[model samples]
Target: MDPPTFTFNFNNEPWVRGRHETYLCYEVERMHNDTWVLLNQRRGFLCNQAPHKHGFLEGRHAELCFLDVIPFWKLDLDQDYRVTCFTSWSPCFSCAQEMAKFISKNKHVSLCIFTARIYDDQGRCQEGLRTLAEAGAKISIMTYSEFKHCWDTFVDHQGCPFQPWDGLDEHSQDLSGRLRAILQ
Candidate 1:
């Protein structure tokens, strides 16, 4: 089947900060002649795709949905794979564990997660990102370039350029600091 489509309205607010729901857009790239080449693109979403689950999967997690669907066999130790995630919310703790295990299990695969917002003010989100960082993943808050790229590549922004709300980069820097403190 064709991959999913993204809309500007659904993406804008959640991407600004943690807005209860989450969305993740990912691209898988493989090292080719010392350069990374696109291999696949997909998104794992919430409140949009149906067929429900319990408290575990009840439309709250897009990160876990990403973990559930990634094709593992294509990853080879002899080659390198890079998985980049643009997540609306930073991963939940359980998602961090699974993401850690996924990368730890596949040493040839590297992960870079650029989150639009930290999930919560609580310790869990910080600790969760820390866990992923310890697993050798690169985690950061999305900046303007990344956000614009995500907008152009993923969101159907119609004719409009990516519009930035107030406090975009400032908030990103703050969240980036939070991640640094956690990883430290």
Candidate 2:
């Protein structure tokens, strides 16, 4: 089983203003044949739909993603799953709370989240992130190393290799430190 790759374009999406516009690219993997097999993949955008609608919005919603794939988990409760996500922005407080509850209920699943930036709206986002961390989620900023890893593991090789932005490593390191501090 090869690692799952996600491919999407975030630039053209219809995003709401003043809201945290995010793109969530995620993969669900389970061990099979002594290797990790890709079970499912999804992408979501924030505020794309009304809160009550299903599949209306994809971003800023850890709960939506989990709900979208709930059937898969229920079918094979005995198998452990590793869920990985790359997001344009970190989740908000409501989303974080939802994710924490979902993770707590699902013992066979573990999550790792990589985001481009933290969504600190009035200093409330940190509290949400800390809640997620407390609930066993590993959160980190997407650095050069992580970008390359995702490209290698989850992307089909196009002509271009993974490219590093200026000071991306340093910036990611700083963000990681901050995230660690907040979680602690």
Candidate 3:
């Protein structure tokens, strides 16, 4: 039997006005029948829950982001598993704290995050990323290369190769600076 696969799609553009494009989409993969198969999947938006009213408060934005939603949907909570999350933005301070705590409690789950951009507007964004790194979550900014990976892995394009966005390199450059500063 072939392993099951899944993908994510959205109607709105991330840069569109009035659309924060905030989302947390994740996949849980596990080895079964000698193949890595999709065991589960979940996606959430900050706008869907109470966090919208708080307007991204002090980094604890909403329950919909991976920081809050992942714990509830894992297929085997007590067993070892791998989780890969693709998000619109890197976690802020509070969410990072919560994710660190979650990882501590759930020792069997390993997490890797690929985010389009770092949410550096907060005063503690750098510290948050550093702490999350210290806590064992592998993080990386989504460059055009990763965007192509996302396009390939998580998109359902029909017979078309990934298209490079205009100014994507420039955007990635800026994002790299942010990531470098955080790591430093």
Candidate 4:
């Protein structure tokens, strides 16, 4: 419900190599003084709700967590926002539905998803991706450039440079191919 202020390290093993969890690094941009200024950069993760806690939301996808904070932002409808979400995995089916709805409802906002991997939850994940694509969200696989960007801006490098894992290129190329074919 509010913007985050934490900065955490981005592990190549989990964020770029592992597929078990989804990590989301986001940034909000708006025009200031006729120049685009980065408003904020924050990250979120996909978490399962303990049945007894935080049961109001439908799912625990990163997309849902981000969307839950949109209303509180109370953005300037007169201005355009270039909202960027860089996630380790794509949204699940239910989260995609809500994202499509968010695009249609928020005329001034556009969701650009840079995902490391496409999520296949159940049988409808492909359809969910298509829904967001048709709703005008730009979904792209994370390439070297995007990975470097995340490392520089969002990841807490702690004086260490961005490192590439053993299967980084292979997985990126493969996921990009699959994403294109499925979104086709």
Candidate 5:
């Protein structure tokens, strides 16, 4: 018997530091371009190996297909735990149907963070979002610019869509609304 697990990754994130550059997400609109796993083989994929300087896993994803699978955009919170945000487009009618069977049984929080242009396609292809519903995670559609603006507000950073930090400086604080406006 094998462990009940599946592994997939979106090439959105970029390398912060390490050999697994391909495993990280970046601030790109790859999703909008329809570069789905089903269309572009190199765009996104699923695998179990660490893909780092020291590759840890023993096999590839297709080789271990028996385990339930749902493609996803991965994010490593602390390098100790791997969390996926969204799944990729399925192959066809049967593959899509198969995904529905295992979607809800998942115990991870999947963030379906997509812009407005790509949301419709994502919704049609993916289902079983009980986990997302239970967690109260937002599943709304947003434009690329709008999404970035929201991200900027959420992270409190002026530059870089994927800025790792969420703090502000004294100079930019007032402009960025780090503190409430006060008239004197």
Candidate 6:
């Protein structure tokens, strides 16, 4: 098998969407920007109910503790490339603390992009992203409109089937329009 073209480093278990067989972030020779806008496209931003370690380890487990936030990595190639997404979901207080230490170790990241989605029982998506930001992640929230655009583009390329609840297959129109807007 060929080596992965792209791989992101997170001090935590990385969530790989079932459909995405290959990671494309690394193949990217360059990215358009440092700031990424996240869309809560999935019913839940697919955030963890809480850090997995939290259930078993109370204080020390970096995974469980809320202050300990894990860094989400993406190889954004551009000026001074090798930056991280800094985006996080449902980071507890301890995870947030841990994140600070992790970031201190890796300080090249410019900022964190928060999302408005979360796993059930942990907290609301909006709240989780906000809390992570407050805990030391330099953050930027994506406007709902921008988020929608991103989601549509990703879906059109992915070509995944929408659930019965999916209102309509409107991704193509918006995705094309967004591409044109960005290119022009």
Best candidate (score: TM-score): 4
lDDT of 1 by residue, 31-99 (tens): 675544556533433322333574455553577667766765345558777778887777878888889
Stretches of model 3 off by over 4 angstroms after superposition: 1-19, 31-68, 71-74, 153-160
Indicate whether candidate 1 or candidate 3 has the larger TM-score. 1
- CA deviation > 4 Å runs, candidate 4: 1-20, 31-59
Question: Compared with the true structure, what per-residue lDDT tens digits does model 5 show for residues 142-166?
Answer: 3234334434433334354433223
- TM-score of candidate 1 on Cα atoms, chains taken together: 0.76
Give the clash count for each candidate: 0, 6, 0, 0, 8, 19
Give the whole-model CA lDDT for all candidates, comma-separated: 0.68, 0.63, 0.61, 0.70, 0.27, 0.32
**Candidate 3 pairs with clashing backbones:** none
Best by lDDT: 4
Colliding pairs, model 1: none
Single out the weakest 10-residue window by summed lDDT for candidate 5: 1-10
Indicate the worst ten consecutive residues by lDDT in candidate 3.
1-10
How many collisions between residues are there in candidate 3? 0
Candidate 2 per-residue lDDT, tens place, 1-184, comes to 1122122322112233433445565667774536655555343322223355464443325446645656754537776787777775678888887888878888777888887666667477889998988899888888776567666655556545766656666667777777778888
- Candidate 3: C-alpha RMSD to true structure equals 6.7
Question: How close to the true structure is residue 63 of candidate 6, measured as C-alpha lDDT?
Answer: 29
Work out candidate 2's RMSD over C-alphas: 6.4
In the range 1-184, model 3's lDDT, one tens digit per residue, is 0011111222112343443434555667653434666454443333224434556543445323555556576465556677777666677686778887887787777788877767665598788888878889888877766666656656556646776656777777777777877777
Off by over 4 Å in 6: 1-89, 117-136, 153-184
Better of 1 and 5 by TM-score: 1
- Using lDDT, rank the candidates from best to worst: 4, 1, 2, 3, 6, 5
Please tell me which model should have the higher lDDT, number 1 or number 3.
Answer: 1
Please give the lDDT score at residue 178 for candidate 3.
70
